[PDB]
Design a binder for this molecule. Structure first.
Ligand SMILES: *[C@@H]1O[C@H](CO)[C@@H](O[C@@H]2O[C@H](CO)[C@@H](O[C@@H]3O[C@H](CO[C@H]4O[C@H](CO)[C@@H](O)[C@H](O)[C@@H]4O)[C@@H](O)[C@H](O[C@H]4O[C@H](CO)[C@@H](O)[C@H](O)[C@@H]4O)[C@@H]3O)[C@H](O)[C@H]2NC(C)=O)[C@H](O)[C@H]1NC(C)=O
Ligand SMILES: *[C@@H]1O[C@H](CO)[C@@H](O[C@@H]2O[C@H](CO)[C@@H](O)[C@H](O)[C@H]2NC(C)=O)[C@H](O)[C@H]1NC(C)=O
Ligand SMILES: *[C@@H]1O[C@H](CO)[C@@H](O[C@@H]2O[C@H](CO)[C@@H](O)[C@H](O)[C@H]2NC(C)=O)[C@H](O)[C@H]1NC(C)=O
Ligand SMILES: *[C@@H]1O[C@H](CO)[C@@H](O[C@@H]2O[C@H](CO)[C@@H](O)[C@H](O)[C@H]2NC(C)=O)[C@H](O)[C@H]1NC(C)=O
Ligand SMILES: *[C@@H]1O[C@H](CO[C@@H]2O[C@@H](C)[C@@H](O)[C@@H](O)[C@@H]2O)[C@@H](O)[C@H](O)[C@H]1NC(C)=O
Ligand SMILES: *[C@@H]1O[C@H](CO)[C@@H](O)[C@H](O)[C@H]1NC(C)=O
Ligand SMILES: *[C@@H]1O[C@H](CO)[C@@H](O)[C@H](O)[C@H]1NC(C)=O
Ligand SMILES: *[C@@H]1O[C@H](CO)[C@@H](O)[C@H](O)[C@H]1NC(C)=O
Ligand SMILES: *[C@@H]1O[C@H](CO)[C@@H](O)[C@H](O)[C@H]1NC(C)=O
Lengths: 226, 98, 327, 142, 294
């Protein structure tokens, strides 16, 4: 390695259990420290996965530490057309990070909406409402959905369960039944793609597009287009 | 510029459909960087400058492992007439660990 | 020719209905947070954008198929579930506790690696499931909840007693399950006499018939084999993401930072060109195989909904279509 | 361009076999539930299918299916078998119907709607005695 | 034979250790159930207490190509009683012995025309002091020209004697006298560098591996970490200048008395060829089960 004014505030114990850019004198990358039990040959010092990535590490003093990865927060987005309404979702994560340290391009937020715990993670841009929609058009996963106001707000709802009409049973000769008393004639409506628009193509009007030279060059290719 | 920018550029229009989209997620700032492994003696390039310089078919060999090298103490005093670097950046030869 | 003895044999099968509904980011996967990578990305990028709404469209098509099939199988009115229902039959294994004990022990024997839908990322900070984000992807949550298919299993359980009496589903007739069995056996060609004084022995041997499939849950069950092969299908599908960044695709290395801070700018741009080319072709292969899996899932879902509406809730007359022997 | 056209041939043969599959499903639709009534639960029309209608489209084919859609379900009582106490072998069973204890005794009702009407020979048929059936003595059905 | 499911002397990955998974790797391996390059040491003539003239085979004139190094098993006959080699009617307990190697790239005929002369700078390694010292040196050898001498007359072959009554008793170690016995046949010139190792003694068998690559000659052993286990861990890296294509075993003599003739180890040498094997890395990381490809 090259020479360096060796910084004291760079040790492994300084940010144990925290995401750092690891650089083990050639072993470069970025991951999260953890303390484990010693596995493998300690003279090798480097334990790798099945996919050529480090999992564990034998420290110089002798405290075995794992580094798996510096996993970051997965982010998704919702936006509705014809109602200028949009919000962000973060998968399987407690509401733990605030607007300080992201990456990539400039995130956009609106007036404070805030971080809310969902079973799928954390959400920004939603107001809590114990609502139930059976026919949600744009769900939020698991059994979650949001519905926009008719400066509107999408509001939280769980994907409602369509309760069937509960009818009991009798253990006697008499039997309990349920019966329709009115009706309609519903139209089940669907469509299939039988025969697409069939199409052919020239060799020399698609590929030479009329080129003389092209002609003499394509004669070595020849029968491919044929 | 924002989420709507990467949204509408992906659809190439000012009008899109409503929908759950896997927008490009972020990466948290790491807490720092760690540079630790054992170092002992520094790299000793004395036999390169010691003795008779041998011939092009007598190219004399030097192995360097477990040492510390500095090109600012080595290449600065080298009166380099020509420098070339095959499939490697010339600047990073004095930067990375091998 | 006529047989003088009989038994009740169970046929076991499975249908791969809904494949893994996933997503992959452009920049975090192909580019992995590297500056010169996004400026060169700028060179291309047409592929990434398009195939993302292509997979979005495929995923929403699968979701529409899923909601259509659960709309179809939803019995409009059903029967409550209590312990001890079904007479002397030990159907407590299929009775939900909701969590039905049969699917509980199937979930035990099936090696289920749930992709951290509630812990996940936090499961990775506390300690393969975390490996869903190394380069980066996300298998989306179900659009459903457990308890929701628990409710659909309850609905079809009520429809078992309610449908198999007479064609015409407007009337719901959830008979006491023993008399429902009696009527079904009378319908499929067994005389009322032996159905009138010999219910005891047939009930007992039906009981150990349903007991034998509980202890038979091992490699010998072909339905187990296709379930685990579907699990391996999901595993190789996610390996098509997880294993390809280790490949250099002809480059001098497969690590991006390696390239960008140990190569000159022109040669590193050439190597990034090679890497992004190989990675986008792997994406095209992914798109093709998920299209194949999507259409296969669509036809399998059609088959499953037809099987469950014809010969599950009712007694289809097609010979051995879904059960060998006189089902 | 030749590689793009190889991809074109591959996706075209995929669409060709898909169109073939759509062709046998097309004939299955038009020959089962369009020119007859399917005996399958929600095969092409949801609920109890009545009729179906089919019209061509420039790449495909269009299907409406008019079917019976129940609503306003109420709770009633039904029996299992009307059998004489003196003659248990004398039993009757509805021809795809139901027994309803009407006001104004068990009478016949169609198996899809609140349609009660007095029990006749034209909607029932004789069956075997069973222990789970029922007796009537104050007014035997005809 | 050599079992691969028991992993009898196979190279370890140099810096890539795994755990509890099976992994494929392309490297240098031998075949399965092979025979070897069987040689064995023995004791010389003796009567009473004085040891008479030596007792060695024609193994000094049997030369094989280096290829990709070789693996040596040591003390597989140890803990047991075998017949004395010089006296077949006599048997004694088998004790572990260690071999001395020479490496170069030239073949020539001796002073009597027997093939085996090596020119220029060549490597010689030798175990001495009951195997405590493993000294190696890449120097210029000079044959002597006197009686029974390699460049002299009345010469048949070369060997290294050892007087264990005075050589490697408790302490002493006889100022590495087997090197002087090598010096009693050869001389040293123009040498660049020189290596020496301290290895303790035990009763369990030993697995050794030698190979070369352009960065250096790599020597692997188990003892250094896996004294109770077994693996190839690189305990030595010779900074070599030129590749090696020929090698030979130096015969070794022991100045033991006739009545106390002790059986020595019967070692095996297996050659290494470019293959691809699959390894079963266990939870502890000890490789114990492997399997071939071809
Ligand atoms: C000649 O005869 C001697 C007998 O004296 C043999 O020596 C024995 O060799 C066996 C085989 O390895 C040894 O058995 C091993 O014992 C280990 C425990 O050793 C403890 O005790 C010793 C002595 O006090 C300590 O030095 C040591 O540090 C330990 O505290 C077990 O743990 C071993 O099992 C583990 O290793 C094996 C091999 O990797 C794995 O497969 C196992 O799963 C497990 O992980 C093993 O059982 C025995 O201890 C030795 N005895 C002595 C006194 O040394 C020679 O091997 C024999 N030689 C020949 C050529 O036959
Ligand atoms: C129905 O089957 C279940 C499944 O075996 C039976 O549950 C077992 O009950 C015994 C004691 O009664 C326990 O020792 C077993 O561990 C249970 N098995 C399981 C898998 O939990 C149950 O007893 C049966 N019920 C009847 C009425 O036969
Ligand atoms: C009509 O009444 C008769 C009375 O004998 C019933 O026959 C017996 O009913 C008792 C209890 O209801 C049962 O325990 C017996 O097993 C029945 N006998 C037989 C031979 O089955 C009969 O069930 C009643 N109902 C009908 C005929 O529908
Ligand atoms: C090392 O690998 C073995 C082999 O797979 C693991 O043993 C398995 O453990 C699981 C979890 O309990 C069981 O379901 C399997 O039946 C076990 N298989 C065998 C063959 O034993 C073991 O858990 C692994 N250990 C570590 C620390 O990774
Ligand atoms: C690191 O851990 C060492 C022992 O490991 C212990 O057991 C394993 C399985 C892990 O759960 C680990 O967290 C446990 O502590 C300790 O001896 C050592 O002191 C620990 N390091 C520090 C800095 O405390
Ligand atoms: C949101 O409100 C519901 C009831 O209205 C409540 O059960 C739930 O805990 C609330 N969410 C949070 C995060 O407090
Ligand atoms: C059914 O509903 C329609 C419209 O709501 C009504 O006209 C009709 O009278 C109703 N029939 C019965 C039997 O309730
Ligand atoms: C049918 O076979 C089984 C076992 O062979 C026997 O227990 C049972 O009594 C038999 N039943 C008849 C009706 O023969
Ligand atoms: C071996 O050990 C002895 C005593 O500890 C020491 O004098 C000698 O120098 C050592 N030799 C080597 C090569 O380490």
């Amino acid at each position: 390695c090259p020479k360096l004014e060796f910084a004291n505030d760079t040790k492994i114990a300084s940010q144990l259990g925290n995401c750092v850019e690891y650089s083990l004198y050639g072993v470069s990358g970025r991951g999260v420290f953890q303390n484990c039990t010693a596995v493998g040959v300690r003279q090798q010092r480097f334990v790798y996965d099945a996919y050529q990535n480090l999992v564990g590490y034998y420290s110089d003093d002798g405290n075995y530490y794992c580094l798996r990865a510096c996993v970051s927060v997965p982010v998704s987005v919702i936006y509705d057309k014809e109602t200028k309404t949009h919000a962000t979702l973060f998968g399987s994560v407690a509401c733990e990070h605030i607007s300080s340290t992201m990456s990539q391009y400039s995130r956009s937020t609106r007036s404070m909406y805030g971080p809310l715990q969902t079973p799928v993670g954390c959400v920004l841009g939603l107001v809590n409402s114990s609502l139930f929609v059976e026919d949600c058009k744009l769900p939020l996963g698991q059994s979650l959905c949001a519905l926009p106001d008719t400066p509107g707000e999408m509001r939280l709802a769980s994907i409602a369960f369509n309760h069937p009409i509960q009818v009991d049973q009798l253990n006697s000769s008499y039997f309990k039944l349920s019966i329709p008393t009115n009706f309609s004639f519903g139209v089940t409506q669907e469509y299939i793609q039988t025969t697409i628009q069939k199409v052919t193509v020239d060799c020399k009007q698609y590929v030479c597009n009329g080129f003389q030279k092209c002609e003499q060059l394509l004669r070595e290719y020849g029968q491919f287009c044929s | 510029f924002n989420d709507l920018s990467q949204l509408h550029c992906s659809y190439e229009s000012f009008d899109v459909e409503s929908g759950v989209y896997s927008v490009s997620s972020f990466e948290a700032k790491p807490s720092g960087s760690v540079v630790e492994q054992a170092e002992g003696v520094e790299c000793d390039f004395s036999p390169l400058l010691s003795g008779t310089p041998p011939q092009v078919y007598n190219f004399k060999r030097l192995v360097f492992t477990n040492c510390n090298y500095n090109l600012t103490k080595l290449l600065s005093l080298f009166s380099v007439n020509d420098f070339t670097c095959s499939q490697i950046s010339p600047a990073a030869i004095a930067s990375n660990c091998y | 020719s006529i047989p003088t003895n009989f038994s009740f044999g169970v046929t076991q099968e499975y249908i791969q209905t809904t494949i893994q509904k996933v997503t992959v980011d452009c920049k975090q996967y192909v580019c992995n947070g590297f500056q010169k990578c996004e400026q060169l990305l700028r060179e291309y990028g047409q592929f990434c954008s398009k195939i993302n709404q292509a997979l979005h469209g495929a995923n929403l098509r699968q979701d529409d198929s899923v909601r259509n099939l659960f709309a179809s199988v939803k019995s409009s009115q059903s029967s409550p579930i209590i312990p001890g229902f079904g007479g002397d039959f030990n159907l407590t294994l299929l009775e939900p506790v909701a969590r039905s004990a049969i699917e509980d022990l199937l979930f035990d024997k099936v090696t289920i690696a749930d992709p951290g839908y509630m812990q996940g990322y936090d499961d990775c900070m506390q300690q393969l499931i975390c490996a869903q984000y190394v380069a980066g992807y996300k298998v989306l949550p179900p659009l459903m909840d457990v308890n929701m298919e628990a409710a659909y299993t309850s609905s079809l359980l009520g429809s078992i007693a309610g449908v198999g009496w007479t064609a015409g589903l407007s009337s719901f007739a959830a008979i006491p399950f023993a008399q429902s069995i009696f009527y079904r056996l009378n319908g499929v060609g067994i005389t009322q006499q032996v159905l009138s004084e010999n219910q005891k022995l047939i009930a007992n041997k039906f009981n150990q018939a349903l007991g034998a499939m509980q202890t038979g849950f091992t490699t010998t069950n072909e339905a187990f084999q296709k379930v685990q092969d579907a699990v391996n299908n999901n595993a190789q599908a996610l390996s098509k993401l997880a294993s390809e960044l280790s490949n250099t695709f002809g480059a001098i290395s497969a690590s991006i930072g390696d390239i960008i801070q140990r190569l000159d700018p022109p040669e590193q741009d050439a190597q990034i060109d090679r890497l992004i080319n190989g990675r986008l072709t792997t994406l095209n292969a992914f798109v093709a195989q998920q299209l194949v899996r999507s259409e296969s899932a669509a036809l399998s879902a059609q088959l499953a909904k037809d099987k469950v509406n014809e010969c599950v809730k009712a007694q289809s007359k097609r010979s051995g279509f879904c059960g060998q022997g006189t089902h | 361009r030749l590689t793009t056209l190889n991809a074109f041939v591959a996706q075209q043969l995929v669409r060709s076999e898909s169109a073939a599959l759509s062709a046998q499903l097309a004939k299955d639709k038009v020959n089962e539930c369009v020119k007859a009534q399917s005996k399958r639960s929600g095969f092409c029309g949801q609920g109890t299918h009545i009729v179906s209608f089919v019209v061509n489209a420039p790449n495909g084919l269009y299907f409406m299916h008019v079917g019976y859609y129940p609503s306003n379900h109420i709770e009633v009582v039904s029996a299992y078998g009307l059998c004489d106490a003196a003659n248990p072998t004398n039993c009757i069973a509805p021809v795809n119907g139901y027994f309803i204890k009407t006001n104004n005794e068990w009478s016949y009702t169609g198996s899809s709607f609140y349609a009660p009407e007095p029990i006749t020979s034209l909607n029932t048929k004789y069956v075997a005695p069973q222990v789970t059936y029922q007796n009537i003595s104050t007014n035997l059905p005809p | 034979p050599i079992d691969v499911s028991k992993a009898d002397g196979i190279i370890y990955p140099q810096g890539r250790t795994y755990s509890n998974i099976t992994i494929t790797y392309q490297g240098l391996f031998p075949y399965q159930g092979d025979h070897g390059d069987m040689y064995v040491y023995s004791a010389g003539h003796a009567t009473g207490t004085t040891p008479q003239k030596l007792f060695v085979a024609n193994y000094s004139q049997d030369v094989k190509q280096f290829a990709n190094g070789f693996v040596v098993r040591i003390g597989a006959a140890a803990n047991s009683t075998g017949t004395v080699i010089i006296s077949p009617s006599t048997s004694a307990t088998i004790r572990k012995i260690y071999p001395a190697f020479m490496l170069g790239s030239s073949v020539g005929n001796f002073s009597d025309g027997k093939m085996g002369r090596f020119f220029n700078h060549t490597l010689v390694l030798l175990p001495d002091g009951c195997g405590t010292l493993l000294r190696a040196f890449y120097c210029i050898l000079e044959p002597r020209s006197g009686n029974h001498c390699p460049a002299g007359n009345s010469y048949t072959s070369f060997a290294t004697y050892h007087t264990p009554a005075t050589d490697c008793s408790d302490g002493n170690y006889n100022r590495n006298a087997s090197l002087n016995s090598f010096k009693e046949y050869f001389n040293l010139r123009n040498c660049t560098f020189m290596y020496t190792y301290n290895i303790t003694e035990d009763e369990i068998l030993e697995w050794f591996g030698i190979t070369q690559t352009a960065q250096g000659v790599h020597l692997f052993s188990s003892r250094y970490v896996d004294l109770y286990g077994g693996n190839m861990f690189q305990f030595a890296t010779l900074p070599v200048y030129d590749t090696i294509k020929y090698y030979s075993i130096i015969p070794h003599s022991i100045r033991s008395i006739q009545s106390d003739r002790k059986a020595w180890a019967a070692f095996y040498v297996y050659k290494l060829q470019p293959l691809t094997f699959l390894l079963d890395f266990s939870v502890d990381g000890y490789i114990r089960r492997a399997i071939d490809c071809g």
